[PDB]
Design a protein around this ligand. Structure first.
Ligand code: AGS
Ligand code: MG
Ligand code: ZN
Lengths: 628, 49
């Protein structure tokens, strides 16, 4: 037939029209022609290149643009829009033949090609779906809330007869309904036939709950939700909590005896997803060369610190501590017996309104594995490990908590002072031995909790006191204060010049944020940080020894002079650990004397800031050589 | 202060332990130099060898 004759319809509906064999083979021929000959008048066929790429990477998905099919064969685009199931089946057979022409043995390897329609023009929200959209193609936006596990769904079903024992040839399984068998062809009987899963072929199946994104929801109304079924190649592509656009067939669930609660013949609906599009710390070979180029620069550490938290103004010491915590040191197990922690723990103790929460959020966006937890609030991952039974599923799960989940990563704890006893024991154990022991519900085990910790806390009474020292200013007991490497005390002393630039920064953010209206870019910095944590592992040599013992001996006796809380071995280890993170920002295999001096500066500045006002003025002049 | 005055628990708990050690902060230069050298030996890798 012809395209104009395809536009005219003889059957009652479009589905029965496409169902006719002459019309179906005409559609298949026209779709094969369109797949073969289509070009953008640039001398290149995009679909031939796509077929070659999917053949070379061994993929069962062919991404087909809807605009290309619409401009060339408008009636076929209309047929795909209104009756997508059988149209997609036909064009899947067409694309399978097109791939077969390119690769002859691709059929025995895969035997299935799924066509993913891209750039469907009309976009529906979840609240405006009606029955007119049923059995039609729809493109909707939404945020994924939860996803099930991947299940095997029958694809090529193979049966065996109980009377004879013979295995009867495979049948394709429709995804819409269950298929059954009534004849044996060997016994010529209608006897009981059993499915054997050994010879049956399966495809992946997943269910995803999609809700309307809260920004698009009208004010008084609730966000609507739908169930989206993801097939074999589409499973586990959408992490819960991310916003996607799904194109698929809007259809009805079939359930026994409908719904007895309503009193009306009411059907549940789903979206059978044809395609998923999303609205990664992988570096290429060129990106590694660019990393070496930017790390060769002398002011790489200054530039990294300045790139820390662009929304935060004027807090250079906090940004330096964040840079050390993100880059981290080298954990070392010497001869098996003795273990030394190699990740920096930072505690931001500050008065309210000092933007600690924004810093924690920046670290969460920046770090590879960052887990946010809070002592005061409830809508967060808990810090304590547990074994819990689902009240619906009746199936137990072991959760390690935020500290175990942030293993080889970052744990960001907001409201550090407001914990209960169980959380305090959990973070105490995690900072003590980097593990969490659980003996509950028959499970006795130890989970690895080698997580760097960045915490935010407030002083007692809502304001820091300079005359009192650090231990009196917090409810935190001394052993949990000792485990932190960097202790950033932040107070907003009223200085007119500082308040002027801070207010100017806030107002300029407000003005640029209005709808009617040196730093490394963050995408590059994120991969640079991930590369440094897994590739460098800086080391130090034996001739650098004579200086660190020199300064540390000059440290402790000064702490003897004023009677403050002492410099222990932990301060020396914090010096040697922070220096291994400064050599990671330089991407250097050795730890230099300049990185070591900068680490000494950070540790001494954190020690002096933690003192009372009487001790601080004496300690500042004695260590002015190290602070510079 | 007394050893029982320093601990934040009952003095009768001390009697239940067979050996009690009181670890001291020496605050000496030559001991601090040696312990710093030892820790740098551990961190460098000379201690492993
Ligand atoms: N130096 C700064 N640069 C930029 N914004 C700042 C700065 N200091 C404060 N702010 C702003 O002040 C507000 C403080 O909000 P939060 O950071 O959420 O509160 P907080 O600092 O965590 O203190 P809490 O929650 O009361 S203990 C935010 O809008 C910040 O953007
Ligand atoms: Mg806060
Ligand atoms: Zn049989």
């Amino acid at each position: 037939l012809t395209l104009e004759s395809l536009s005219n319809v003889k059957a009652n509906s479009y589905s029965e029209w496409i169902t006719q064999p002459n019309v179906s083979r005409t559609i298949a021929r026209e779709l094969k022609s369109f797949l073969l000959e289509y070009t953008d008048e640039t001398g290149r066929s995009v679909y031939g290149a796509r077929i070659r790429t999917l053949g070379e990477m061994n993929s069962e998905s062919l991404e087909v643009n809807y605009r290309h099919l619409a401009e060339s064969k408008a009636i076929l685009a209309l047929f795909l829009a209104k009756c997508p199931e059988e149209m997609l089946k036909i064009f899947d057979l067409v694309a399978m033949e097109a791939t077969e022409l390119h690769y002859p043995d691709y059929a025995r390897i895969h035997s299935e090609i799924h066509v993913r329609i891209s750039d469907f023009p009309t976009i529906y929200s979840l609240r405006e779906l009606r029955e007119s959209n049923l059995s039609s193609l729809v493109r909707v936006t939404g945020v994924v809330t939860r996803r099930t596990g991947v299940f095997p769904q029958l694809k090529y079903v193979k049966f065996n007869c109980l009377k004879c024992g013979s295995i009867l040839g495979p049948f394709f399984q429709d995804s819409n309904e269950e298929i059954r068998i009534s004849f044996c062809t060997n016994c010529k009987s209608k006897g009981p036939f059993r499915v054997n899963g050994e010879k049956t072929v399966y495809r992946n199946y997943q269910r995803v709950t999609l809700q309307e994104a809260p920004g698009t929801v009208p004010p008084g109304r609730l966000p609507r939700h739908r169930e989206v079924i993801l097939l074999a190649d589409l499973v586990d592509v959408s992490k819960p909590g991310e916003e996607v656009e799904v194109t698929g067939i809007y259809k009805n669930n079939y359930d026994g005896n409908l719904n007895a609660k309503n009193g009306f013949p009411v059907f549940a609906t789903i979206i059978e997803a044809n395609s998923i599009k999303r609205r990664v710390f992988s570096w290429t070979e060129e990106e590694e060369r660019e990393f070496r180029k930017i790390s060769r620069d002398r002011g790489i550490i200054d530039k990294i610190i300045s790139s820390m938290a662009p929304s935060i103004y004027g807090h250079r010491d906090i940004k330096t501590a964040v840079a050390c915590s993100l880059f981290g040191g080298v954990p070392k197990n010497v001869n098996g017996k003795h273990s030394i922690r190699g990740d920096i723990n930072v505690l931001l103790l500050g008065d309210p309104g000092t933007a600690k929460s924004q810093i924690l959020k920046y670290v969460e966006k920046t770090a590879h594995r960052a887990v946010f937890a809070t002592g005061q609030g409830a809508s967060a991952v808990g810090l304590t490990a547990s074994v819990r039974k689902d009240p619906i599923t009746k199936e137990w799960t072991l959760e390690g908590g935020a500290l175990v989940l942030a293993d080889k990563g970052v744990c960001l704890i907001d409201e550090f002072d407001k914990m209960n006893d169980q959380d305090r024991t959990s973070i105490h154990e995690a900072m003590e031995q980097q593990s969490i022991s659980i003996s509950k519900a028959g499970i006795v085990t130890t989970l690895q909790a080698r997580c760097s910790i960045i915490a935010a806390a407030n002083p007692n009474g809502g304001r820091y006191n300079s005359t009192l020292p650090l231990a009196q200013n917090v409810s935190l007991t001394e052993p949990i204060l000792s485990r932190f490497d960097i202790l950033c005390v932040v107070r907003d002393l009223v200085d007119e010049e500082a308040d002027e630039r801070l207010a100017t920064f806030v107002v300029d953010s407000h003005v640029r944020s209005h709808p009617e209206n040196s730093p490394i870019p963050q995408e590059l910095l994120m991969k640079y940080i991930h590369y440094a944590r897994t590739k460098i592992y800086p080391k130090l040599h034996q001739m650098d020894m004579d200086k660190v013992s020199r300064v540390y001996a000059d440290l402790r006796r000064e702490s003897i002079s004023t009677g403050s809380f002492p410099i222990t071995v932990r301060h020396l280890e914090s010096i040697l650990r922070i220096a291994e993170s400064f050599a990671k920002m330089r991407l250097s295999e050795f730890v230099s004397s300049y990185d070591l001096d900068r680490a000494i500066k950070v540790v001494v500045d954190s020690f002096v800031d933690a003192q009372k006002v009487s001790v601080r003025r004496q300690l500042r002049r004695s260590f002015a050589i190290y602070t510079l | 202060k007394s050893p029982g005055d320093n601990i934040d628990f009952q003095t009768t708990i001390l009697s239940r332990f067979d050996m009690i050690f009181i670890v001291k902060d020496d605050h000496n230069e030559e001991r601090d130099i040696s312990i710093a050298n030892h820790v740098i030996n551990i961190h460098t890798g000379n201690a492993n060898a």
